[PDB]
Each structure stands twice: as C-alpha cells, then as structure tokens.
Design a protein around this ligand. Sequence first.
Ligand SMILES: C[C@H]1CN(CCOc2ccc([C@@H]3Oc4ccc(O)cc4S[C@@H]3c3ccc(O)cc3)cc2)C[C@@H]1C
Ligand SMILES: C[C@H]1CN(CCOc2ccc([C@@H]3Oc4ccc(O)cc4S[C@@H]3c3ccc(O)cc3)cc2)C[C@@H]1C
Lengths: 245, 245
Amino acid sequence: ALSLTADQMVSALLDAEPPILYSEYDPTRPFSEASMMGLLTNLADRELVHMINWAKRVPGFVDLTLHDQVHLLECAWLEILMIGLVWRSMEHPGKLLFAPNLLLDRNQGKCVEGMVEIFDMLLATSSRFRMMNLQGEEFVCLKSIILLNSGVYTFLSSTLKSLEEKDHIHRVLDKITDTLIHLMAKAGLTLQQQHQRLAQLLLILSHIRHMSNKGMEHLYSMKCKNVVPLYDLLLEMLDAHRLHA
Amino acid sequence: ALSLTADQMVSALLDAEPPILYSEYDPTRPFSEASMMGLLTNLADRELVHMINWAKRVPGFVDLTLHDQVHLLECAWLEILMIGLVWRSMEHPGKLLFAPNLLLDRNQGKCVEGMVEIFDMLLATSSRFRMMNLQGEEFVCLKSIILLNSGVYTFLSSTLKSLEEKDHIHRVLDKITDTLIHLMAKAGLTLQQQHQRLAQLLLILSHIRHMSNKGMEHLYSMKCKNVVPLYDLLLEMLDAHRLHA
Ligand SMILES: C[C@H]1CN(CCOc2ccc([C@@H]3Oc4ccc(O)cc4S[C@@H]3c3ccc(O)cc3)cc2)C[C@@H]1C
Ligand SMILES: C[C@H]1CN(CCOc2ccc([C@@H]3Oc4ccc(O)cc4S[C@@H]3c3ccc(O)cc3)cc2)C[C@@H]1C
C-alpha cells in the first residue's frame, strides 16, 4: 500500500469488491405482508460479513492491530453500506437499489416512521454521484478512504503502538489520494480539474458521515438488532484462525 | 468569488473573521456556582450573531437567496462554532479555549453528563490541527467550505432557481479549492504534497460533521434553548433592512 503503485492500488481495490446480495423474501407472495425494516435489516446483516472480507483486502488494513481494525469498522460500517447503496442506485433516478430484487422509491420509505428522511438524503447523494459521473475506480478509492478515515480521530489512548498505527493509516490515505489524482490525470483532466474533482469527491464524504449519523439515530429506536455489542461481533469475525488455509 | 483571485479570496476571508468573544460571568466569584452549560450556551448564542455577519462577507454567500442562506447556516452553525473552537484551542494542548477567560480541560467536561465525550472529540481534532501545523489562511478556507458545503445536498425541491443556486455554490467551492492549492504552492509544497494536504484537510471536515451531529444529539436533551425555531431566528437575522446604511 506504501510501495504499491497507483495502478496496483486501483486493481487491488477492484479485485476486493464484495458481491451484490439479494433480498431474502418469497417473490411469489404479496408485499404488504413484508416487514420493510425486516427485509432491509436482514440484507444489511448479510452484507456485513462480506464487508469484513473486503476490508481485509484493502491495502494496509490487515497490517493494523486486530483492535484497531475493529474500531475502524465499528465507526464506518454504516457509511460503507450507504456509499455502496448510493453507488448501485446511481443509474436508477428516484430509486434506491437496496438489492437487484429490492428497488424502492421515496414513497416506499414512508412505510417506516422517520425513514423517508433518510431515503431522501441517500437519493440526493445518488443524484450527485450521477451528476458528477462518478467512476467505478473513484468509488472504490472513496469507500477505502471511509474505512480508514472515519474512526482514526477517535482512537482513545496514545501508546507508542497507537501512534505508529495512526501514522500508517495516514500514509495509506495519502496513497489513495495519489491514486485518485492518478486516475483523474489518466482521464485527461487538467491539473486544475484534478484538484477540484478531488475536493468535490472528498466533500461528499462529509455528507455520507451525516447520513450515517442520522441513520444510527434513526435505527437506535427500533427492533433492528442490538444483541451482543458490535465490537465483540466484529472482533469474532475479524479474529479468524488460519486453519481453513 | 468567481472572478476574485486566489489572493483576493484569502484576503476577503481574513478580513471577514469574527471577533473572539468572552465568557460572561463574574470573575470575582467562585466557580462551583456557575452553570457550565449556562456559560457555554450564552457564549455560543452571542457568537451566532457574529457568525451571520461573517457569512455575509464570505464571497458568493449573499448572492444566494435569503432562503438558501438560512438553510446553509441552519445546517452548518454547530460545525462552524466547533472548527472555531478547535482552531483557538490549537496552541493549548489538552484544553479547549471556549473563550480567553474560559479554558477547560477534559475533567472540567465531566461536570456535564455526556459532555466529556464531545470534549474528547474536539480535543483530538485540535491536536490533529496542531500536528498538521494548520495555517490561519487554510483555516478560513476550511470554515468557508463548511458554510457552503454542509447543507448543499439537502435543498428539498429542485426549481430552476434552486438548480442555479447549487451551481453557484459548487463554483464558489471550486474557487476555495483553487485558493487552498495556491496557498500550499506558495508555501513551497510539491505538487504531490499539495494534493495530499488538500485531502488531509478536507477529510477532517468529515470529523467536524461527526462532532456536530453528536453535539446536536447531546444538546437535544437539555435546557439549552429551543424557543422559536432556528429557521425563523436565522431568517430574522439574515433578512436585514438596509436603513442603517
Ligand atoms: C451490520 C449491522 C446492521 N444491523 C442492524 C440493522 O442495520 C441496518 C438496517 C437497515 C438499513 C437500511 O437498509 C440498507 C440495506 C443495505 C444497504 O447496503 C444499506 C441500507 S441503508 C438503510 C437504512 C439505514 C439507516 C436508516 O435509519 C434507515 C435505513 C441499514 C442498516 C446490525 C449489524 C451489526
Ligand atoms: C446558535 C444556537 C446555539 N444555541 C443553543 C446552545 O448551543 C450550544 C451550547 C453549548 C455549546 C458548547 O460550547 C461552545 C461554546 C462556543 C463555541 O464556539 C463552541 C462550543 S461547543 C460546546 C458543545 C457543543 C455540543 C455539545 O453537545 C456539548 C458542548 C455549543 C452550542 C441555540 C442557538 C440558536
């Protein structure tokens, strides 16, 4: 990640992309009888296992301690799901493609109290991506930045080890910045367009943080799931043996 | 703002800086008897009038409709107060300089339920600014970006006028990006350091959004003040006559 080229980061990031999952409900049955939140929650929980997989393939992530890996994912998981959703919704104006067999419009979000507000924010982000003509190569860089950036300011303590971890993370972030600029230059943007586009992309990440924060507030008031704290469940998942090697 | 130079934006932004206010409490009296939240709330309300003043001097802001000006400030006001606080706290490791006569450490935040968590996040941002050696010229650009960026994705409708406003805002944001790159080049950074530093700065804005969101959640559960909705109070303030010209 720190000696990988900009072309190697791009291909590592493309190679690491997770699969597109489907909603799990019987399509031979009516819809009024489905719990929309139940459908969405079940989807999101299944994505989380693939997210851990993906994160381990982001250059530099697994060189972190297990504790720091847990922290970053605990901080970024909803942001990561949401940029993923906005990305596959890009080509579907006015709709969110939760899954290939679960495409919802804003009125379908009114079904859940306080959810249309979140839908509207996601929908607006999807339209901005569309207006910017965001590219697959740029999107994977952005998702990796979310993973590494979102919880890097909240590491508690400040041990020697902790200091080293922070330095490495900021080093990897620098390399993804170099990769985004490289992508843009390749595409034929001027120096000036490059830095402007870089800023445009990075400023969207402030909106994705906003959506995550608002979505956590909204989720935190519902059946959803809050069994076994998230840290411990992430740890479990990340603290793998290497027996099935 | 769209024909202003990078040097003209910088000087307009420096010229527009608001004053540093003091806490209003009798310094000849003990401290256990003060409401810390009362002190902080009174400080923050006094800053808001100066914030409106400042925003009107940001290049491009007053060319927006009154409604859009209200929206952006309603979305960004806590982010703007917080970056301001982290900026004047930079030279005071382990402390937050709320005002020149009100410098608090984390233990002083434990006095309020759930406030130490916010203090710790602000303190960590202040240390990052310090570690990056953030410059006065960079800070004013960043505060202006917060003003223009934070609520630009949440404008409801999408009228012709609305579309025009968005275009102008993104145009002004582009010019502040050009200004930040200009500042960095002047300072002698390489091309590579410039784009890396730009990204480092912009990624901090995602943490400031985080702090604002968490602070609104925390404020929203206390005496504070929620009399007359914020929109109407902002409108009042922004919808000035020009009689005292
Ligand atoms: C991975 C964690 C998620 N599990 C709890 C439920 O989480 C979610 C439930 C539903 C969704 C909602 O559905 C999805 C589904 C997939 C996806 O990639 C994105 C979203 S976003 C949306 C959402 C988010 C926040 C809201 O306030 C409203 C709608 C997203 C997450 C707990 C588990 C540890
Ligand atoms: C401008 C709006 C603010 N008024 C309500 C009270 O708002 C505030 C009250 C206290 C502060 C707290 O004190 C200050 C004071 C000045 C400053 O520049 C920053 C801060 S930050 C801090 C804070 C913020 C959020 C928390 O959860 C905990 C501490 C910041 C804002 C309502 C008014 C319309």
